[PDB]
From a paper:
By co-opting KBTBD4, a substrate receptor of the CUL3–RING E3 ubiquitin ligase (CRL3) complex, UM171 promotes the degradation of the LSD1–CoREST corepressor complex, thereby limiting haematopoietic stem cell attrition. Together, the BTB-BACK modules of the two KBTBD4 protomers give rise to a V-shaped platform, which holds the two KELCH-repeat domains on the same side of the E3 homodimer without physically contacting one another.
To resolve the mechanism of action of UM171, we next assembled the KBTBD4–UM171–LHC complex in the presence of InsP6 and determined its structure using cryo-electron microscopy (cryo-EM) at an average resolution of 3.77 Å. KBTBD4 and HDAC1 are well resolved in the three-dimensional (3D) reconstruction map, whereas only partial densities are visible for the ELM2-SANT1 domain of CoREST in the rest of LHC. Although the SANT1 domain of CoREST is within close vicinity of KBTBD4, the closest Cα atoms between the two proteins remain 9 Å apart, and therefore complexation is exclusively driven by interactions between KBTBD4 and HDAC1. The two KBTBD4 protomers interact with HDAC1 through two distinct interfaces: (1) KBTBD4-A engages with the outer edge of the HDAC1 catalytic domain; whereas (2) KBTBD4-B cups HDAC1 at its active-site pocket. A single molecule of UM171 is situated at the HDAC1–KBTBD4-B interface.
Numbering used by the authors:
A (entry chain A): 23 to 93, 99 to 474, 481 to 534
B (entry chain C): 8 to 376
C (entry chain D): 1 to 134
D (entry chain B): 26 to 475, 481 to 534
Write the structure that this text describes.
């Protein structure tokens, strides 16, 4: 794209070859590993001998560069593994490795030892995804010692909210001062009883740590449990539609808080922070603000535009609530992205979408806004069930459409889980989107459109029509697909219009 | 042998639209001459249209528009440019000698035909002179200066209760639909091609407003529609409308620029299916009123209109053209029917089912009466 | 699509008892030139049509008008057909020659062609143009 | 995939594991010359090279290194004959991927890159040698393709040797040409003015007493065709309602000739040329198209336009016998995206897949299978149309439309014409760029200002025209695209004054 004046295509020019990355990367994986010539270094690990190529290893990992270019034909590695180093070599040559949960921590430590940065980051993310309560104080120890701030934050978030049952573990009792200071100064919830944790930690050796005890009290923060799953629906006979605010507990007792019961109508609601934002009124433009503890219906600025069946997605990164897609009362599918600011109460615009969709499902991903499915316009006068994945950035304000498409289509509901985008649709088939590596998985369900909400690390899938089969509220373990059934103590709904996560 | 009255004047075939212009008002004279050689006069009355006037013409159009059309002449061409450019009587509707005379002739023909129909003297009234269904209330468009079919429907409305308008012309009948877009006594059914075509109106979602809601049935299509598809789309909708609307007078605009290969034509319909459609509408023994309008290939227009006049009288006609002054004009096949072209249709069966089903839902909403 | 009294028509109201009074008062706005005769079969009409064609030069319209002028009486029409000269557009050979020259020089612009033929109105040269192109 | 679960086990497909290897090799393996294990010496100078990249990129070295002979296992191998500099360029290409091909040093690279089977460089050199064969080596590159089995160059160096057979006849190289090449050059339609019968007789006259009975084998295979390579001009004389269709014939004797005019009298808008006949959309209502014939001057009739549009782009495609129309404006200032294509043998107007972003008033350039929509204007949500800068590539074999990422250096109204692989572009504010789609790069070529320019390409040279005609010098510039040698031709008695359209 450079309008160079020196080169003339009839005398001389520079032949910029864009295919000279595939040929070498394929020639090495075909010629260098399948039948093993050109071997010039012999690395022996735990008795078994390897023949390897200093060129690729030194061109991919800097540690081997410092190794080979220092100042014998066979070199033995002290302690890695028989299988972990096999996987590492396979990744170095090919570029595909099968990460497993059983042999993950060793791969992480070794991949950081050999400075393979991409696999190190991938292992960091995958290990951050799989820390429930059991190793949350062992993984945290392997993050402070290893200088991986993102994993350190991810293993601290899941350890702060389980401080109650984590007190009695002897690993927490043998915890040094710095990590305790960093896990306490983050806003420990109210029900986790942090002061008793402080006293019990001191009670090990109180006569030696009594003067050191008050250093943590002068730094402890307190906050109330306000992680909710907002449910909105009518009872099919009353005009007013309620806003039951569930609270997810860890003792198999999902609690129900007070209702709000606004009385006009509800369409396209959303949740951000700890309060609820709803779109309603006789003319769908006025917006109410719901407060949980102080049950009130506050007022906010109305919608500046006119749309219906649009997608409201929350962005807590910049304290803004977006709105994408919709239908403009003339059966014309619009592509207009307006956002509202919480602290300023204004309704301004951004760039527009590429292909207009209506009635989709939107999922925030801490920096990118995902338009999932819905129905897209057809030049055949009508609307067909859409299947595209539309990306809307919020930091750079750019829009682009991903090439690959969903396995199904139609109306669908989406929610996220710690990196992912969980999807359910009509004719239950739970797929697990992953945007970083662009692949799909499936999770069968025991067989009515379903809804998905995320809280407390687990996923909760709801029904639309209740009529009491078992409980109509399924808790799903996303690891082993352990579909269990919760109580649903005295939910009196009948429709479940929207479920806000 | 049903009493059918016919209108024709010898002056309509002389008015010339200019060099390199699609619409040729000479076509009607050759259509009359083709009837003038088939013996169809012996079983059909022939009248002469009267020259129209102002007071019957101003019932719809504005006074200043009629004043301009009276005062226009090609001699002061470079003197009244503003009046031309406001009323859109410029390059899209060129001026010529006796433009208002042409309007008089067509208006008199159509209005007198309505006066014949409305008096229960003639059952089916045929007038190919008028049919100019693109002129709006105070501006010309689509080579149509004065909207004659609107005047005819207005005349029919003084005596009848509900008048149904049928549009087979390839263009959208926006002129008639614009005038009756609010009233509840006229249902206009128009089958028109609309991807980008003139005039660009006639969307599905425009059905009606005000008192006249669901009292305008528009129907888009796509290019290359063959005969069997057109029959399968024209039989159900018309039967449905005539079942739930119960009109007492049907004004059928028998367009002829939808045939196989006109200069502005885009469809692929033969004369046989067009005649089958009009016979279908005719088979309901209602007080009919035929109109013309459109048609931009003189040979095809003459053939189609002569076969339409034959089928309106229920008289079989030979395929071979007779001894006349137009031997080499109609050559080289010398036949009456037209073979279809090689255009590939772009309206699938599923699209047609969907559009028919949508129209059925729209028509189910008609209030019971 | 525009909505407003400056675009739509002012529909008249309906009166069920006014149809008969209005119907019989309006005139028949047209003059009759031909009507079918049931007692008059096709053979003698086909004969008389060629009769009018070959020796006297009558065309379709003028020959058929005379039949109704005498109320479908063929004999009286034969009696009076030579007495009425079927006045045509008198295109003399010179008129054809200058029309030929003018068409070649100027083309389809009949307003200019009127300049070399000032005695003929435009509605008359268009008819001769369409008849010549045969 | 149902087997993998993101919380138990899955496959890590790394898409960045092509950049890291290709950069590590060009950074670590070349800037300091380590890990060398084979020494290749060509013409005295000693090189240090790595067996891995060479054996993984060129199969010839794979066969040489992994052989069984004891000569290959010696540390230093000697290449018999390539060059000193050519092998330096080849090592630079194998390691980095960027080599500076020069016109003075191309044929050597062609033969050597074919010897080492580096097929990508071989194809690029084949194209770059197909670009620069004017007349002088047109019977020396032809012999370099028949000996190497590269039919594309063999066709591109026969097309440009057939159309110059008159002047080529006297050259002694043409006289020493074997039978097969002469049979393949004659049997493809030698032009009428080249005197092929004189050429075949003069070829025999070298040794006639030995090849006399051998002569008539080719006279029974000679094909003859008339010169019909034109540059069509359309423009009204600013005072007459009829717009003519002057048909220029491009000759090689510095005498560009003018054939008979056509002078249609309705109006001209958005015309196209295909084969040897001109197509034009026109009339008072812009829907009917006329088909002009060159020798027999007649205005035939064709199938009218099925849709309504203006300022669209008519693009010719002789590959599948079609005339494409793309973009346009739709009578209410709405820019439409829809391509209807016409067939000459059927006179039918069908549709195809629609464009991605609607453009109007653009310039289209055929590329023997790809139709390029260059520039024009695109819609803006601020009720307006801005001068567009997008390169829309509309395929014609698979029927997929996609938008290329990079953009032009300028924007607005523009005219484009192709030259042997390229898409030359000119616009207001004269600045001649040279598009190249295969490797997606531009160049520039300044023009002598001392008025929108029009481009038509014929006979290998590029002729640029003016809009306003008032006689500066000749207002018709013959441009040599190699050295930017802008010369001025005659324009013998052109009476044009506006030059609405110039058709390549
Ligand atoms: O004399 P006009 O009524 O103005 O019409 C003529 C006539 O067409 P019609 O038969 O439709 O009247 C010509 O037809 P022929 O006499 O050759 O059969 C036709 O010529 P084409 O056959 O080439 O269409 C010509 O068209 P053009 O002016 O493009 O040559 C067209 O003239 P208009 O375009 O002025 O109507
Ligand atoms: C019964 N009937 N059937 N078809 C038509 C008909 C009538 C007119 C046109 C037409 C079809 N197609 C056309 N295409 C164009 C090209 C164009 C495209 C996009 C933007 C601008 C121009 N311009 C037309 N008219 C111009 C427009 C300005 C106005 N002052 C009159 C002159 C017409 N009438
Ligand atoms: Zn029409």
């Amino acid at each position: 794209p450079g309008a160079s004046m020196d080169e003339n295509y009839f005398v001389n020019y520079t032949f910029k070859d864009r295919s000279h990355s595939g040929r070498v990367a394929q020639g090495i994986m075909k010629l260098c590993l399948e039948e093993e010539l050109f071997a010039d270094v012999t690395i022996s690990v735990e008795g078994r001998e390897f023949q390897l190529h200093r060129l690729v290893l030194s061109a991919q990992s800097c540690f081997f560069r410092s190794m080979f270019t220092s100042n014998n034909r066979v070199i033995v590695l002290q302690d890695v593994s028989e299988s972990v180093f096999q996987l590492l070599v396979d990744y170095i040559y090919h570029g595909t490795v099968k990460l497993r949960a059983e042999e993950l921590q060793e791969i992480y430590e070794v991949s950081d030892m050999y400075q393979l940065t991409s696999l190190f980051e991938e292992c960091s993310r995958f290990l951050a995804r799989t820390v429930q309560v059991g190793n949350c104080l062992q993984v945290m120890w392997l993050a402070d010692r290893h200088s991986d701030p993102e994993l350190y934050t991810a293993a601290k978030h899941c350890a702060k909210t389980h401080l109650a049952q984590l007190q009695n573990t002897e690993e927490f009792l043998h915890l040094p001062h710095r990590l305790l200071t960093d896990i306490i100064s983050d806003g420990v919830p109210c029900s986790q009883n942090p002061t008793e944790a402080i006293e019990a930690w001191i009670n090990f050796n109180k006569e030696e740590r009594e003067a050191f005890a008050e250093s943590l009290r002068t730094s402890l923060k307190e906050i109330g449990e306000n992680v909710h799953i907002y449910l909105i629906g009518k009872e099919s006979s009353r005009t007013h539609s309620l806003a039951v605010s569930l609270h997810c507990a860890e003792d198999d007792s999902i609690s129900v808080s007070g209702q709000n019961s606004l009385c006009h109508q509800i369409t396209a609601a959303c949740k951000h922070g700890g309060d609820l934002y709803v779109v309603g009124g006789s003319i769908p433009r006025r917006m109410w603000k719901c407060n949980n503890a102080t049950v009130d219906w506050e007022w906010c600025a109305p919608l500046p535009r006119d749309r219906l069946q649009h997608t409201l997605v929350s962005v807590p990164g910049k304290d803004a609530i977006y709105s994408l897609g919709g239908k403009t009362l003339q059966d014309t599918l619009s592509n207009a992205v307006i956002y509202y600011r919480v602290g300023d109460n204004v309704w301004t615009e951004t760039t527009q979408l590429e292909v207009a969709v209506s009635g989709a499902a939107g999922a925030n991903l801490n920096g990118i806004i995902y338009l999932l499915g819905g129905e897209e316009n057809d030049l055949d006068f009508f609307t067909k069930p859409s299947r595209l994945i539309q990306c809307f950035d919020t930091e750079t304000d750019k829009c682009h459409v991903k090439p690959y498409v969903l396995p199904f289509a139609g109306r669908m509901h989406a929610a996220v889980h710690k990196d992912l985008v969980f999807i359910v649709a009509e004719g239950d088939s739970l797929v697990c989107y992953n945007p970083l590596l662009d692949s799909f998985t499936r999770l069968c369900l025991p067989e009515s459109l379903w809804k998905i909400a995320s809280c407390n690390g687990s996923i909760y899938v709801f029904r639309d029509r209740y009529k009491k089969g078992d409980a109509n509220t399924y808790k799903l373990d996303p690891a082993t697909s352990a579909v269990t059934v919760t109580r649903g103590i005295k939910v009196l709904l009948t429709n479940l219009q929207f479920v806000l996560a | 042998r049903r009493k059918v009255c016919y209108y024709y004047d010898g002056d309509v075939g002389n008015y010339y639209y200019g060099q390199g212009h699609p619409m040729k008002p000479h076509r009607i004279r050759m259509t009359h001459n083709l009837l003038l050689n088939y013996g169809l006069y012996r079983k059909m009355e022939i009248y002469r249209p009267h020259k129209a006037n102002a007071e019957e013409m101003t019932k719809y159009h504005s006074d200043d528009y009629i004043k301009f059309l009276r005062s226009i002449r090609p001699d002061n061409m470079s003197e009244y440019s503003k009046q031309m450019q406001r009323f859109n009587v410029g390059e899209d509707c060129p001026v010529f000698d006796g433009l208002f005379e042409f309007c008089q002739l067509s208006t008199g023909g159509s209005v007198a035909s309505a006066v014949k129909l409305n008096k229960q003297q003639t059952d089916i009234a045929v007038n190919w002179a008028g049919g100019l269904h693109h002129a709006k209330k105070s501006e010309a468009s689509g080579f149509c200066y004065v909207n004659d079919i609107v005047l005819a429907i207005l005349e029919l409305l003084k005596y009848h209760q509900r008048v149904l308008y049928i549009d087979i012309d390839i263009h959208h009948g926006d002129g008639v639909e614009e005038a009756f877009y609010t009233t509840d006594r006229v249902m206009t059914v128009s089958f028109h091609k609309y991807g980008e075509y003139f005039p660009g109106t006639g969307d599905l979602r425009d059905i009606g407003a005000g008192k006249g809601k669901y009292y305008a049935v528009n129907y888009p299509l796509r290019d290359g529609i063959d005969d069997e598809s057109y029959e399968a789309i024209f039989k159900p909708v018309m039967s449905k409308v005539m079942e739930m609307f119960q009109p007492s007078a049907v004004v059928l605009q028998c367009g002829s620029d939808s045939l196989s290969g006109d200069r502005l034509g885009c469809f692929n319909l033969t004369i046989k299916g067009h005649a089958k459609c009009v016979e279908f509408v005719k088979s309901f023994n209602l007080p009919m009123l035929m109109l013309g309008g459109g048609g931009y290939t003189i040979r095809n227009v003459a053939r189609c209109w002569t076969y339409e006049t034959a089928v309106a009288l229920d008289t079989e006609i030979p395929n071979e053209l007779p001894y006349n002054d137009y031997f080499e004009y109609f050559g080289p096949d010398f036949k009456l029917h037209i073979s279809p072209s090689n255009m590939t249709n772009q309206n699938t069966n599923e699209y047609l089912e969907k559009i028919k089903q949508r129209l059925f839902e729209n028509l189910r909403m008609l209030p019971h009466a | 699509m525009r909505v407003g009294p400056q675009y739509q028509a002012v529909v008249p109201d309906f009166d069920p008892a006014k149809l008969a009074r209005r119907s019989q008062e309006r005139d028949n706005l047209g003059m009759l030139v031909w009507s079918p005769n049931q007692n008059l079969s096709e053979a003698k009409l086909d004969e008389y049509i060629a009769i009018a064609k070959e020796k006297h030069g009558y065309n379709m319209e003028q020959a058929l008008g005379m039949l109704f002028w005498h109320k479908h009486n063929i004999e009286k029409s034969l009696a009076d057909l030579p007495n009425f000269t079927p006045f045509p557009d008198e295109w003399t050979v010179e008129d054809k020659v200058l029309f030929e020259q003018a068409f070649s020089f100027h083309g389809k612009t009949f307003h200019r062609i009127q300049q070399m033929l000032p005695d003929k109105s435009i509605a008359s040269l268009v008819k001769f143009y369409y008849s010549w192109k045969k």
